[PDB]
């Protein structure tokens, strides 16, 4: 039937109506420290989130959003690998089934509890939709989770899963700042690949923070309970959506530190 990460449509049956799967510049993928080239010209990151305007949070049967007004140059990021200013439109996560999984990066192969990923447009394009036909249409930043300490700043997201449990619940969710969700350093990893979600368009710039932020067991549990179903269908729970490494093939990942 349609996409999704059960057994029978899982990232393993993608390609069959989403050709690009098998494309080149595929992600998730598995970053390798020593063989990661140390860029000197690349550039300090920019994140400019002071102005940032939430406006809902909606479970849309793959993941929870958190969409933010991009209307105009409220929550941009810019620096970097990048040429332009990319827009704030909205964050998710992807998170396992246990805590030994879940992240869709990798570091020499070790695999996080979860992976927020922030998605920011190529203004450049006018609008989000014109973005994702362009090899530099958007930028995503990336962040592993690991089990450790609560993360304060992450317990208003927690708090209104409880109305968004199924596929299509949307909810308000205004003056939530993302900055409580960033580590205390910007050191990165770049390389060019594509959504991990059909359909997988090659159209990002990756920004993978160096750094993991922690959240307690708590925390990431109650992202299990949420689900993939809609309201009054078998429950599903919403779990291992996470797609796997992708082979590199013909690129370089560039390291921002040495
Ligand atoms: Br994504
Ligand atoms: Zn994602």
Redesign the pocket.
Known sequence: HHWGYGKHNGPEHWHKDFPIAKGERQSPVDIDTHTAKYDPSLKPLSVSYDQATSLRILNNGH?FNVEFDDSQDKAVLKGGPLDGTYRLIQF???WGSLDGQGS?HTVDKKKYAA?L?L?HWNTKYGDFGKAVQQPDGLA?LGIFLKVGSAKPGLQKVVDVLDSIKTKGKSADFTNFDPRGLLPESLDYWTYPGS???PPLLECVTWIVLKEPISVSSEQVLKFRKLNFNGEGEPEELMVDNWRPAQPLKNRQIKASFK
């Open positions: 993941a998710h996560f992807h869709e992976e990923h998605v995503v959504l991990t979600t």
